[PDB]
Design a protein around this ligand. Structure first.
Ligand code: CL
Ligand code: CL
Ligand code: CL
Ligand code: NA
Length: 124
């Protein structure tokens, strides 16, 4: 039974690479983080920064989340991210993703003690 903070780490952290360098990055990572078990997760973002740097965003700019909650934070600096989105020809169990690498600010929702990211809201 996964904690919220651990689920965020599993779904969104990839510190082992600086950037996606291949069109198959999302296919490989969505499978290896178990995001294609039972269903293809339609959209998921991976962040290529240290866990510490992502946790620090919870002390940066406080903004609204898309759902109206006020525990979201926008990173002051841009970060290396990869957006993974299912293509039109994706169909479980053969999930297929488009990989889009970018450098953008991240917006995360933070909760708990320690106060850490639990939800990825958006990138800008
Ligand atoms: Cl897992
Ligand atoms: Cl996401
Ligand atoms: Cl402010
Ligand atoms: Na948690």
């Amino acid at each position: 039974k996964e904690t919220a903070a651990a689920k965020f780490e599993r779904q969104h952290m990839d510190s082992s690479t600086s950037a996606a360098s291949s069109s198959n990055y999302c296919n490989q990572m969505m499978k290896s983080r178990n995001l294609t078990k039972d269903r293809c997760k339609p959209v998921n973002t991976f962040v290529h920064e240290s866990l510490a740097d992502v946790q620090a965003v919870c002390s940066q700019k406080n903004v609204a989340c898309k759902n109206g909650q006020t525990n979201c934070y926008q990173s002051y600096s841009t970060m290396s991210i990869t957006d993974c989105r299912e293509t039109g020809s994706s169909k479980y169990p053969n999930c297929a993703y488009k990989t889009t690498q970018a450098n953008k600010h991240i917006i995360v929702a933070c909760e708990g003690n320690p106060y850490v990211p639990v939800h990825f809201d958006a990138s800008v």
